[model samples]
Structures are given as structure tokens and as C-alpha cells.
Target: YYDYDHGSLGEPIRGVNIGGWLLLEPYITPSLFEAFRTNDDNDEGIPVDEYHFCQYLGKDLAKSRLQSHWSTFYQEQDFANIASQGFNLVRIPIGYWAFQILDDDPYVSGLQESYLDQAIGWARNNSLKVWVDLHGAAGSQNGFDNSGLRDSYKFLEDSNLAVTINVLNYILKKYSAEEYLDIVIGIELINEPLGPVLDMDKMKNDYLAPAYEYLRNNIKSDQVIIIHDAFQPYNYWDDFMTENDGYWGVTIDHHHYQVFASDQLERSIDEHIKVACEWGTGVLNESHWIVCGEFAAALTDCIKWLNSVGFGARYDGSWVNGDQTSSYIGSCANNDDIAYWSDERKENTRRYVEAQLDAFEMRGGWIIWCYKTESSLEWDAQRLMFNGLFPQPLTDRKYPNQCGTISN
Candidate 1:
């Protein structure tokens, strides 16, 4: 339908994610978070994620306000705009709350399905493919605000795995219909399940394994099923559901970002490129298809509310979760705003963007973490493209082979 082969193995991919539309993330759409600033906190302060956002506002108010958001956030022209920017696929992240709010769950549902179908129709008109990414679970998967909840990792311990699968079943069945099979290429089972603090064995056998089995039975043969790497190394997933193991095509989703940890934030410009090149050329797996699903060009995590709402950043040692939290690197002033960036800043960002593109091309492909943001220009692919940092057609690079040329 999109005049491209969705089944082409090892083919270089050009994709973009539609985040913060269906699943609410604080950093992506801070304006939405502003709606809760004046509301009573009930000792929880302002709402940080969708979980508390719904809880803060009554269900009726949440539905009405969120309806306005879902209706307006990604219009038909947005799909046309994305395809015009040379993206082949759009990964649309939706949460489990779309189906079941359940007991004690504060999510408001029943409208996302219509909006999702609307987006698919727009994608169909634009000749774009779609990947319905289950971005959040019944409980929080990772503690990130993007997971629809902040500071909670209950997806595995509290029977949330079974609940997550129920949502997948409903989504898979709909895409299997003839109208969606072509434009909707695949489904990501769940996005970024917490593997670090949770039990590893349970994540493997209890969560992923069963989800894979049920999704396979429900979807078409060629429609790919993707799973996140659970913050583990590439080889950690060796032969899990490979063609060797009778699973025809189960791709791995890996997110690469340089602004998370203290060491990454401490790296100089070239040092940043060095690690990306190493990751692309050295450790990229051959055992399975890898789509670096989430990567950004941001060298610093300085955007407002990035780490958490009203919290400091790891870049300037203002945040507590750093290798050495006491060492202040520099001021985070104007990092989020490109209007103040000097020529040197622009060039460094250009080189960093090119280096990441070069490395991710070595794998199946990459979908930049998000399409647009309110102020996090570094993470916004469209904004970078418009500001002449990211390439227009994605592959038409002004600075090519930067991985080999840039010095660390």
C-alpha cells in the first residue's frame, strides 16, 4: 500500500514515532500538564503522568479535555507532513488504558480506538505504514513518565502481564482485518518493560514468551511482531524466537540515547560520536533484526521537566541520579531553545545527528524517539529537520560517513 515492502529483511528503514498524542508524556506536551497545576494534589502534588493526570481531574473532565487533545494533536496534515519528510512508517504509541481502566485504575478510555482508526485512515491517505506500539501497560512498565505512570514498575509483579496481553489481543485482532493489514505493518508487544530491577526470569518466561505466543496466533504470518530488549544487551536475546527457533521474523527494538547516564552526559562532542560508532559497527547484532526504535540527537538532558516534572537535569549535575551528582558541569541555559544556539553548537549537533543516522542505518533502521515536542528541540526530529540539523529526506546527509571522519 505504501509502495514499499514491509517484509524486506535487513532493509534500511525510515520511520518516525507519533508519541505524546495517544500516550501522554510530560516532556513532549508540557502544555497538557499545565492543566493540572492549579488542581488540588491530594498530597500527590501535580499530575506527572497520565495515571495521576486522570486521577487529578475527574473522569468526566479528563475525558472532555483529553478528547480535545486526541482530536487536535495529530491531524490529517500531520501524516502528510511526516511522509513528506521521507518517513516510511509511523510508530504510534497507545496505552493499555484504551481498553480497560479496571479497579483502582484512573485511566479514561473508549475514545482512543476511534482516534486510532482516524489516524490509520490518514496514514492510508498519505501512503504511510503504521506500527501500533503498546507504549504503556496495565501498571507502569518502566518508571518513566512516558509509560503512563511515573516511578512505578508494577507491570510484572502484579499480574499486569496477563492484563497487557488482553490489550494486545484486541489490537492484533483489529489489525488482522483486511482494511488494516497493509497500512498497519506490525505491533510492538509492549514498550520498554522494566528489566533492571524486576526479576529477569519472569520477564522472559512469564511476560514476553506468552505475549509472543498469543500475538502470533492472532496476527497474519508476514505481519511482524516486535519486542523491546528490556534494557538488556543485544546478545542477551540470542535465539529467543529466531528463525532458528521456528519464529520466522521477530525483530528486537532497542532505544539508544546519549543523555541518560552521568558518563554519557559527561562525554565531549566527539566522545559522544565515538560511542555511537562503536555501537553501530561493533556490537550491532546479526542474530536478529534490530530497529533502534528510540534515539535522539540531544547531548544534554536539559529540557524542562525531562527527568521529571519540576526536577533538575543530569547534564549540569542538577539531578540526583548521576555517577557523581556533586559535580556541576555547566549551565543548562538555552539548551532547549535553538534560537540561542551558536554556530559551534549547530555544527556539533549536526555532526551528532549524522553520526547517529550512520550507526542506526547499520541495523534494520531507526525511528527517532518522537516527531515533535513543545520545547525539547533536540529530541524532535521534525524540528531538527526544519532547523537544518537533521537531513530533509533523512538519507540526504550534508555530512556523510561522520562515524569514520569525526575524531573522539
Candidate 2:
């Protein structure tokens, strides 16, 4: 079993991502980007994702603006608020560029390293464990905006790999010996790495295995090394995890989101609820410890279609762009179609969330997609937990009888 100051990871990971704070996605903070765009006409064609948002603003201005945002977006009260809800963990997604901005980086800015120290301190103060996720690697891991750049995936190249390893080493050295080590349980190696060019099997054998070995040698065995499956099927790594037995604690970080897939879009709310109850947690095999690092009950096809249309398209069609004719819904408060839901829809949403929570507890644990959003309450974990839609903070929740039975 994986060791910890409190106990093994036997208990569920009950957590939420502190998204939009460190990693500024336009979907998370639309108003901020809108303000930036409104102030600069030269940036009219640029997308409002984290990469372009910073690129358009320039290094000096972008750093100053983001530094202020980082300080205020999530404060001590937010940590306390998370703890109050019985969430024992919080996943903090950080881009590698936040540490050191290189010449080729599309965005020429970095977050103050001091901010990370403060985040760990706050989480410790509130008795919440932190998952330090290197959400963006040196090159664009998946070409998504969260990676601090929007470009073709270059993370697999030798130069980017070396830079990524250095960043990982830095993070490990910075935190491994700290008094707050107990609360800092895991370090996720990368976020959702996607590839049209990547060979998943080769990545696992060549890159991931070596990286795992390096991490195992550096950090204490008690602190886990989390590997994102890079959106591969859940069972794809069963043999890999089983073969690589001896190491620092290793767990697979799988993210399950239904709202994005076409098949999922076609599913009825009742079907979604039923599938969540029956198949959600059962997907895991007895290969490795696992966690649903991100998930949500929001099943709106509208939201799915909006995001699928790509960032540039979404921004152009959004009200933020002053397109009154656009039917695109914002991720935050302006879109009330899902928020002002019907009684049946609302009740089904609650049921779907609860069922997933129940299933997640049975496998290993779950950290919902986000703690809060600027607008949509249906997608916000904090709002749902507060309104009594979910079970009371850790008190009366149901769990499976045994780990393996539910896990495999």
C-alpha cells in the first residue's frame, strides 16, 4: 500500500481542482480576456486562450496582470472553503512556462514561484492535500491553451523532454523535504497529452517508464508519481502498471468527461445517470492505484458543441466578442439554460453527480473537474456541495465493500 502521514491512499481522494487560478483558461475567466481584447484592437484576430491572451499583452504587461490575478483568484478563504466541504485534496494545474519562459514559448511570461509556495502553505493550513500537476510541459503537451501556448505538440522532442525533466526535478526538490510534505501527496507528470503523431505504446515504454524511474529515485517512495494515460483507454496501462512493480508510489490519473464525446452527447440524462452508476468506477482493473482527477455532472450538449468548435470559433461566437447574434453559451453566469434547469433536469443532475461520487469512492477517489466557475452553477462543485445537492461533507457517504472487487 502507498504510505502517507495519515494513512494509505485506501481512502478516496475526495478532491477538486483549483482551476482557472494558476492556469487561466478563457472559459474559466472570460471577462478577464474580454477586458484585454476590448482594450487592444490589435489583438482582434487573436484567440483568448491563455497562450494568446498573454502573447497579445506582451511580457511585462502580461506578467504584471497575471501576477495580480494569481494573487487574488484564489486566496486563503478559498482553501478554507474547500476544506469546509470535506474535500481532502486539491489539484493545482501549473504550466512549465510558469516556471521558466524560453525564447520559443508563444507566451513570454511566468508565474511567481512564490505563488506555489503560498498555495502549498494554504492547503496545509486547511488540512487539504495538494496534487502538484505539471499541467503544461516544456513544449505544448497537447496544443491546448492550458499548456501556455497554442501550437503543434512538441513535448515529445528531445529538447522539450530535457526541459520538462529539469522542471520536474525542481518541483520535487522544492517540496520533498518541506514540513508540508504530508499534505503534498502526489505529483502528476503531465496533463492531457494528445497526439496525432504520438505512438501511445512507444511513449509508455520509452518516455514514461524512464521518467517514472527518475522520479522514483528522487522523491520519497511515499509520495506518489501520477502518470496521465494521455487519454488512452483505461485498461491500456494495466500491463504497464503491473510490469513496473518497484518504484515510488505510482498511480494512473484518468480523466473522465462525457460532455465532449459525440456518443455522450446523444445519451439521455437517464442513460447518463445509469451508465455512471454501473460503469463509472468499474472501468478500473487491478493494475494500479487510480483517481478520476477530473469529472463533472454537467451534461449539456450545448456546452459540448461549443467547446468542440475550437477556441477561436467559440470566442468569435461568444457574447464576450459582442456577437449578439451568437447562440454560444459562456462557461460562466451568463448562460442560464443549464442553471435555470427544469425540476426533472435538476433532480437528474443531482442524482447523476451523487451516483458518480458513489462509484468514484469505490474505485480509488475522484476530484471533480473544478471547484468553481464564473457562471454555470450546474458545473461548479462548490455550488453543488453547498446547496445540499451532494452528500454532506464526507459524513454519510457510501463506499464499496472492498477495493479490488470494485477496482477490477
Candidate 3:
């Protein structure tokens, strides 16, 4: 288990990431899934394809259900169990809509207060901390489905951006109350704002600097600022690592996933740790921390292809785990080449999961791809067919649940 009090950078947090859609997982049912799919008028407008399928779920189908108050839900199951697993932090990918007061916000139902409160309360109860991430920022941070605004990324600028900032400011202020003060250590400005390599530059000049100005001048909180790496093929940022003019500790939120699977066997644990440590050194030198915001893939096929294509290239092609909603998976849909964790995949995954722990320990901070998302039809089918591996017992930490060495 990663202990929070170990060092200044905090604990080496290792846990599954809970995406916005996943948080609403429990409420989704087959009946609701059908309704959401029925809305397919083929009227997906410019960038409407931009909206994450989950957002649509939140707006259309989910709205009808009486959801558990966010905080209660968090405390009742996910958060409590996760903490007991020896995990210290949870990377929560919240949409900009989570903070908006607008009644008709397309992506969020404007009722996120329920879930937001649940997150804070649960974290406090469990002695856990959180990293608040705006996965789907205005105009689509990464222009990916993860952002929930797929085909339509135009919301990144103009009034959309302004509204997003307003939401951020509101959230920062609201969560800064005395009772819940300091439960959150940082805020992830935007997931992956794809732009010039000088995105760090843009953040300072355009996003962070301006937002920080507002925060420091008006809002007074000591929360850390986390900046995500620009969308890649490129991955080095020295120019803006220095807090964009002496701000404070700025962390880097980078993601890794196998797009192509070539390596039949897992990379040696030592190699994983070495790579992570290398990145950590850079982060420390720059006085910035590094955290992984997202990463997930099937070991069976992705590893087999990694030998040639190397990390993150296998999920493409036509057929998708036997089911055929190629459009359902997002821009990376064709990237699908593997199914649910198969028997061989599961054995390899266990080794890989341990290697990831080594890498995270070396790197200092870590968060997995996602925690929940049972509601969406796409996920329903995916989980059903692909066959998911259960969450296993974390070796390092001991807590309440001692069911066995194996847990899901």
C-alpha cells in the first residue's frame, strides 16, 4: 500500500481510475440502454459525434433514474472498497459539465452535485485523497471519446471555454470549504489539450496563467496545479516545466496504453520500473510530479503486437471482440483487436499489473484508466463479451476486506 505521509510528493497511489461515465454505472440497465440507443435519430450534428457516448447516457437515459446521492454512493461501495484495497488515491475524470449550473447542459445532467459531494465525503471518510481531472474540457481536450465530446471539439474555445473556466472556479471555491478543505491536493486543468508542442506555452499564456491569475487573485487555496501532456507522438516538455513563471508545484498527467499488441510475454518488471523511474527523474528535476491519467488494453493481442508497433497500436482493425459496433468505441474503435481478458491474457495481466506497481513505486504516483461504466450499452456488451478480470488483492496494503488472495 502506498502511504500518503511517506514523502512530500505524497504516496505512490495505485488504483483504478473512475471515469465520469463509470461513476453512473450502477444505475444503467438493459431497459435504459435501449432507450439511449433509440435516440439515434442519425441527427448527430457537427461535433455531436464529438459527445462521448457516456455523456449521452448521462443526459438522455440516466436522467430518468433516481440516482443515489453521489457522496452516499461513493461511500457505500467504490471508494470504501478501493481504500480497503490499499489504494490511497483515486483519479476522477470529471467532465466540465459536472460543475455547470446550466439546466440543459448536454453532456452532464446538471445534477453532478450529487456525485461531487459523494466523492469528497468518501475520500474524507477513508483518509484518501483525490486528483480532480477535467477529462472532457471545453472543445474536447484531446478530441477523443474519453473527453465525452468526440466529433465535436469546437467547444474548446469561445464561450464554451469561458463556461468551463467558470465551472472550474466554482468547483475550486465550493470544494474549498472548511470541513472538506485540503482533501483534494490538486486539479487537472484539462486532459490533453491537443495543439502545438508549445501547449505548455499555451497553458501558461492562454489557459493556466489566466486561470491561475483568477485563482490566486480571487480564490485563495493552496491546491497544486496539474498540467497534462500535449497529445502525442511527441513527449518532452522542458520549456514550461518551471511553473510558467514561478507558480507552484505543477504536475504532469500523461497516459499510456497499448494500441498494438505484439509482445507475447510481459516486459520484465525491472524494465517497467526503469522506464517509469526515468520519467520520474525528469519530473523531479523540473520540480513537477507525474501521474498517469489513463491507460488500458487487452494483454492477449496488444502484447503480441508490441514487438513491432510498440506500445499502443493494437486496438485497430474492423472486427471488435465479436460484436460489431465499430462506431461505438470512438476514434480508437478500429483500434480494437483484442477481447475481454482471456485466460492467457489474465495470467499475463497479473504479471503486468505487478510490473505496473513497480513502475508506479519508482515513479511515485499512479492512477489506472477507469473504475466504473456499467451503464452504457457499449460497455455492457464489451464487458459481457470481453469478460473482465476481477479486481485482485493488492499485495502491499492490508485493510478490512480479507476475502482471500484473489478479489475482483
Measured by lDDT, the strongest candidate is 1
lDDT of 2 by residue, 48-76 (tens): 46777677777788778888888888898
How far is each candidate from the true structure, as Cα RMSD in Å? Answer: 3.0, 5.4, 8.7
Candidate 1 vs candidate 2: the lDDT winner is: 1
Tell me how many clashing residue pairs each candidate has.
Answer: 0, 2, 47
Error of 1 at 234 (Å): 2.1
Predicted structure 3: lDDT: 0.50
In angstroms, how far off is 184's CA in candidate 1?
A: 1.7
Residue 48 Cα positional deviation in candidate 2, in Å, after optimal superposition: 3.3
Evaluation by lDDT, superior candidate among 1 and 3 = 1
What's each prediction's TM-score?
A: 0.92, 0.84, 0.68
Order of quality (lDDT): 1, 2, 3
| Candidate 1: clashing residue pairs, number | 0
Task: Give stretches of model 3 more than 4 Å off.
Answer: 1-10, 22-62, 66-75, 101-108, 196-201, 232-235, 241-244, 260-287, 300-316, 319-343, 373-393, 396-408
User: Quick one: ranking by TM-score, best first?
Assistant: 1, 2, 3
| lDDT of each candidate versus the true structure | 0.80, 0.67, 0.50
TM-score of 3: 0.68
Tens-place lDDT per residue, model 3, 1-408, is: 112325443456565566533222212222222334434543222122214334555555445442432433244467776777666767666777666633444554466666666776777788777777776666665545456554345544556777777877776665544455457766777777765533445455766667666655567655566677775432365555365666655666766544322232234433433343344344444344566665543332222112211113223332243353222122343222334323654444444444444444555556765444333212222232233332344453212222112222
Predicted structure 2: lDDT: 0.67
